[PDB]
Symmetry: D2
């Protein structure tokens, strides 16, 4: 079928797009860099199996894909945002508006555009790549963290109205997901090379390692395959058992 | 100590103000209607034990109460919004921004304004009046429900950084809370008068009744008293057992 | 690899066994009816791709499958119990012990038996089939519901220590899962035939239908494939959107 | 009114009994040591405001108090158990049966005995002192941790059926609660004296300190006062913001 994967170059985009592609889906890909013809084409050249789009806005995109490839059957809103860690009083109120717009508004807009067609054919799948930070908050990241929670809940609420139209909605909240070259949010350097970061990951996750893109993709391809729609409304914590709680003094 | 209760005429406003005032607090009150001196003075006249302020913006309000009454020890962000129920595709993206602006950005702006003074004294209490809908989502209220979840998570995330300064932070998510003459969100008419509504409330809640403003007020006063700061980060579901799940055919 | 599916004739048993077998696994199956050679051989004859065992106790079973098929890589603790709905005061304390013995002690006994061999190879997968009732409790089913919550938490707690040995642990809490000829817990009669029951299911679930054994089987096979071990600790709610919350009077 | 507080000498018993007493309640107290006349009397001597009972079993106790003081209006099942930290394969299946019996069966039995009288007068309050470990599991404590979760869920499920009879049920799950002289589970020595333990607590809780008995008591007296019954079914995490998640390398 036809699927859309946003910000394909960062976070969980590549594992998603690629695995969905492997699963024989037509995968239209969105990303900021697809504004410049050089970047888009460089992309379509390197990945002949992915269909990169230039459209940037939600509605514009949905339409581009609907026309170009018939319709949108799967939506993987892979949302990102570059947050600053800061005491609440040191943030600017616009620093929160940025986070909310990038992590909550964007996916809402996306579902607000493709929603009618899926409901009309009574079929489709919706997936949000959010974050596992709401499950175990770090201090001084209130903006990013709270916005992610809104997205998780958005997904669950939507599963309630779209179930009637046979449309599953899921939220996958990762943490410590190897983003490889992308800086969102766990690039090979330093997470896989610098001893300190390697030891941190080792300590805070139960599996003692970063999550791989293939694992994320396998989940997305599985959910979008229609093999287990009864899971609609589920928030998946892709965080290798994180967080590992520190134990009492004297314990290994 | 000095407390601030926003949108005092609606939602949890009166219960919070009155019970906080009966506890001994100096309660500065905010509300949109107070932009008019006629309203502010009428309110002031009916409630001599409350201090209605005309300030509307976060920074201005905190500063105004800090001047008049020395400081702000307790902040009760009684946030409200009038959402429409609607299929995700029938909403306008602006209908989500609006909801997020009033239910998330607003409480964030207020804490972002009072946070520094509390951290300096290393004392204070922050309480968000959110909603219990995230716990049991209804279909077609995706903007208002997810916005509330952002607020709850904001409170918990904030509890992590402010705890170092001995500042508790809580979220009280109500549902079926009698708002008396206020339309936010369960006014006496028709919730305590109309048989259809009375029946509904009787079915969906365990205690089979609306919550009272006195219960919400007691909880707010208790949390801000310092009797139990160890609860910091807690999300309180004030909904009398809601949601009661419908049982199998043949059962009473 | 070798998998063990308990109580294979009931609950999630068949879906798990069949789909696990279609994936390539050697599926040793347990069941109470297999204490009788007549039953074990009849089952063996109908399902030549399944390996029905007669062992009943945890230690004996793990040992028996370890001998016959080399080892145990995947454990699917498909636990069942026939609880009565009743006011807490109408239950007998023994009615809780019984429930806890079959829904908690049993899965614990099994993992306690296979844990060492998996930790030595540093490979394996543990999956508990629990229940989604903890998420949306019904009144008068306090023994069965709380026992299931113990099972879920057991799975997550176990995911923390076993992750170091590269052993994922999951819990799949189903609800409204078609159990076909099995009485545990939604048999074809009357759940797919009686209009009263068909209506109920249509109201309380988002997808408005029973879950299928194929969906539960797909999920079990996916989790045990190694495609996404980073999900370790996850509690999967397999209930098609349940619980759908009853809306305000006047709404459709 | 008349209230019962079990294991009054350990965990949250003293803060509960005493504060309830201060609140002008007749407080019958249970404890193992109240088997020997020497211990009971020593207790009744030291605390003339508390009424210690010798009865040990649930039913025997409820009856003793009902007769002696008219009826039981408040039940505070303060449950304890001395667990061993151990890899799952190193536990004995009876080590789990112990935990379950002490942490799940006991409170169930207690509510199973006093339940009918509360439902008949359509009034009463039920409180479980459980544990916050299910919210943030440590590795190798699967027994204690999973059983606590069962108790938390028991409480929530009971809130559903007893709400109809106007009986609130709550669960208070502490962690790092100063148990003073009692070894259950954070005695002054070493938690308040040995630098290592003091630094641990400082690190894993947001408030950076143990929770006090007075805080626990204030909550119990507040819930049992009938000031906020609309909170029925709530699980209160009394853990000063625990757990504090470890942040990225380089961060303070
Ligand atoms: C900062 C940004 C993003 C994360 C992971 C995806 O949530 C963690 C810290
Ligand atoms: C609509 C708006 C608000 C509510 C209660 C407070 O959350 C319910 C329906
Ligand atoms: C009774 C027993 C079991 C269920 C489903 C599996 O949890 C529902 C009612
Ligand atoms: C062991 C036993 C009890 C605890 C606290 C109360 O839960 C922690 C470790
Ligand atoms: Cl991540
Ligand atoms: Cl409300
Ligand atoms: Cl089921
Ligand atoms: Cl504790």
């Amino acid at each position: 079928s036809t699927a859309i994967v946003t910000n394909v170059k960062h976070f969980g985009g590549m594992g998603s797009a690629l695995r969905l592609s492997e699963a024989g889906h037509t995968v239209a890909c969105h990303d900021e860099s697809f504004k410049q013809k050089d970047e888009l084409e460089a992309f379509a050249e390197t990945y002949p199996q992915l269909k990169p789009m230039s459209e940037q806005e939600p509605a514009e995109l949905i339409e581009a894909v609907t026309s170009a490839y018939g319709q949108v059957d799967v939506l993987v809103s892979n949302d990102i945002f570059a947050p600053e860690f800061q005491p609440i009083d040191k943030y600017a109120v616009e620093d929160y508006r940025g986070a909310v717009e990038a992590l909550q508004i964007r996916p809402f807009a996306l579902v607000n555009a493709v929603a009618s067609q899926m409901k009309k054919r009574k079929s489709g799948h919706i997936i949000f790549i959010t974050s596992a930070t709401p499950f175990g908050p770090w201090k001084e990241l209130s903006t990013y963290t709270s916005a992610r929670a809104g997205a998780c809940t958005l997904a669950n609420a939507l599963s309630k109205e779209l179930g009637e139209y046979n449309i599953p909605v899921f939220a996958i909240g990762p943490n410590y997901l190897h983003s490889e070259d992308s800086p969102y949010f766990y690039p090979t350097e330093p997470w896989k090379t610098n001893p300190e970061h390697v030891a941190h990951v080792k300590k805070v996750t139960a599996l003692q390692r970063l999550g791989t893109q293939k694992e994320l993709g396998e989940l997305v391809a599985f959910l979008a395959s229609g093999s287990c729609d009864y899971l609609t409304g589920q928030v998946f914590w892709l965080a290798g058992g994180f967080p590992m709680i520190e134990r009492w003094p004297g314990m290994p």
